[PDB]
Amino acid sequence: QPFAWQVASLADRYEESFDIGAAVEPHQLNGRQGKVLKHHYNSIVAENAMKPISLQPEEGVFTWDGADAIVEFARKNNMNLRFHTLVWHNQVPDWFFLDEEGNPMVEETNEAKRQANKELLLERLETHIKTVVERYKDDVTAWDVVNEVVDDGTPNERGLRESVWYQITGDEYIRVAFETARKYAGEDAKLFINDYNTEVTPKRDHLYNLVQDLLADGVPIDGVGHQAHIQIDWPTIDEIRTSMEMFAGLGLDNQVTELDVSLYGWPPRPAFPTYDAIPQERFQAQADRYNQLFELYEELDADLSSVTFWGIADNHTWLDDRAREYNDGVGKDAPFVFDPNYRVKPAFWRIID
Ligand SMILES: [Mg+2]
Numbered sequence: 001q002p003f004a005w006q007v008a009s010l011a012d013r014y015e016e017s018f019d020i021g022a023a024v025e026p027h028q029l030n031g032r033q034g035k036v037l038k039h040h041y042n043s044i045v046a047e048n049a050m051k052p053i054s055l056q057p058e059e060g061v062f063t064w065d066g067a068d069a070i071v072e073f074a075r076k077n078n079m080n081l082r083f084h085t086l087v088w089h090n091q092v093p094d095w096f097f098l099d100e101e102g103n104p105m106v107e108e109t110n111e112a113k114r115q116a117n118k119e120l121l122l123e124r125l126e127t128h129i130k131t132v133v134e135r136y137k138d139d140v141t142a143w144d145v146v147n148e149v150v151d152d153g154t155p156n157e158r159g160l161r162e163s164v165w166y167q168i169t170g171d172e173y174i175r176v177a178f179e180t181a182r183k184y185a186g187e188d189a190k191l192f193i194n195d196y197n198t199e200v201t202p203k204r205d206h207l208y209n210l211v212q213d214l215l216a217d218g219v220p221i222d223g224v225g226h227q228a229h230i231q232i233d234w235p236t237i238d239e240i241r242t243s244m245e246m247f248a249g250l251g252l253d254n255q256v257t258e259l260d261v262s263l264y265g266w267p268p269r270p271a272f273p274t275y276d277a278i279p280q281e282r283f284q285a286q287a288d289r290y291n292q293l294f295e296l297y298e299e300l301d302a303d304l305s306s307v308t309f310w311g312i313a314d315n316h317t318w319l320d321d322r323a324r325e326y327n328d329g330v331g332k333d334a335p336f337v338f339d340p341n342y343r344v345k346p347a348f349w350r351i352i353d
Contacts, residue, residue, distance in 0.1 A: 003341040004036045004313070008352050009273040011042040017301035019043040019080055021125035021308030023258065029233075032342050034073075036312055043141070044078035045177065045257070045308055046070050050084055051091040055210065056128055059095050064135070071139050082257065082308060085144040085194060086129050087177045087311035089163035096124055097164050101193075105135060105166045118169045122176050124334035129177060137234040142255065142306065143226055145181045146174050150207045158213075159206025171210075175219050182220040194225030194257055199243045208246055214280040215250065223253035229310070231262050232289045237296055249304035256297065258310035261286055261347075262319055271323040275314065275340055278332070287346035290337065294351040315340035 010020040021043030028034070048054055049066030055318045056062050059082050072083045099105050105117035151161040160166055173194075181191050185346065193211065211221055224247040228240075244254045261284045264271055272278045297304055311317045314334045323331025334340075337348035 001339070001345065004342045004344060004348075005039045007152070007344050009334055010040045014258065014307075015042075015353055017298050018255075018304050019306040019308075021049040021086075021306060021314070022046060022312050023081070023308065023310045024070060025049070025311070025316075026075075026084070026152075029069065029073045029141060031314055036338065036342055037073075038077055039078075041079065041306060043082065043306055044070065045082040045084050046076055047084075047277060048091070051088060052086070052093045052096075052128065053093045055132060058092055059093075067136070068331065071136060072344060074086065074139060076315045080141040080306070081136075081139050081338070082255075083132075083140045083141040083144060084257075085147040086132065086181065087125070087145065087149075087165065087173065088147040089161065089165060090148075091274065092224070093264070096121060096128075097168065097343050106164060114168075119123065121165075121168050122172060125176055126180050129180045130184050133181060134175045137185045137189065140185070140189070142190045142192060142223075143181055143185065144205045145177050145191045145221075147194045148196065149174055149193070150195050150203055150210060152203055154202055154206070160208065160210070171214075171289075174210075175214065175217070178214070178219050178221055190221045190222045190253065191220055192253075192255065192257075193221060194227060196227040196229050196258075197240040198224065198226045198236075199230075202245070203243075204243050205233060211247065211250060211252065217290070221252065223255060223305075225255050225257040226308075227258040229255045229258060229260055232285050236266055239293050240293075241296060241300065244300055244303060245282065246298075254300075254304045256304070256307040259299040259307060260310050260319055261293070262335055264323070264333065268333060269326040269327040269329045272331065273327075273330050273332065275334060277331050283334070283346050286334070287350045290347040291350035308337060311336060313338040313340060313342050314345075317341075322351070 019039050022041050023045050025047050097105050109115045151159050155162050314336050319333035319335050323333050339345050
């Protein structure tokens with residue numbers, strides 16, 4: 001199979017439908033990775049460099065190096081940039097949720113004091129968002145304002161994930177994150193609520209009702225980010241379609257934000273020990289899946305503005321961690337259309353045609 005830079009550009013192929021993006025790390029902006037990026041994509045997102053704890057690890061202490069390098073890459077290569085992410089319950093500094101006495105706010109029992117912690121947390125969120133937006137508003141083309149605020153089950157009637165943000169502020173942190181993002185980014189900035197398993201119920205319906213409710217109260221939400229951490233047979237093409245159509249019906253835009261097609265089910269066990277151990281049947285099944293997937297994206301391209309892969313080539317993917325985690329430290333997945341050596345896979349040909 002030829003190298004990725006010897007085949008037709010994915011970005012050019014879908015230029016009339018949607019952007020083609022990739023999650024990157026500061027150290028993958030040169031060499032073959034950089035070459036592949038410039039050749040196939042017209043959009044990028046920080047895999048980790050822009051999460052909360054990565055920008056303000058200590059209150060008032062901002063670390064912009066990683067993010068600036070990614071932003072600089074985007075500028076020089078004229079690529080769009082998704083910002084991931086302003087709010088999340090993971091990879092977020094503990095100081096956010098500590099009261100003025102240094103005790104975790106979730107422990108406070110005085111109603112009035114809890115009310116005071118809510119306002120303090122929100123003020124801190126406002127400051128984080130404002131600081132970040134002011135620095136990157138001219139480079140960001142899409143913001144993952146909040147990330148995974150919806151639960152996979154139904155712990156509460158609204159299906160909201162009961163993270164530390166919810167425990168301390170209910171749904172206000174979501175309202176504030178969006179309202180603040182709009183304030184400092186401008187009316188033209190596209191604000192998204194990102195999440196995984198947006199194709200399955202009840203989660204899909206919980207997210208749906210959430211955006212409706214918020215939109216009714218004037219909260220500025222422009223689109224839904226579909227992480228799309230999917231499998232070869234799940235979710236079904238129809239589940240994907242139905243979900244995107246529902247949000248499109250509300251006037252919201254859609255974006256596939258962290259796409260990877262695992263060769264395994266869940267959990268990813270048993271997984272193949274190495275890449276060479278993977279039989280061709282697997283790559284062919286993945287190929288048929290990618291074809292169906294991108295035909296769908298194309299069909300719905302009026303309500304889909306961007307499709308980002310959570311990685312570039314099979315040599316670097318968080319799916320390998322999940323694989324090792326469930327196969328006693330050994331396991332290899334292969335979610336992309338480019339292999340560990342940056343050579344095209346059967347899936348590439350099925351989505352370039
Ligand atoms: Mg095809």
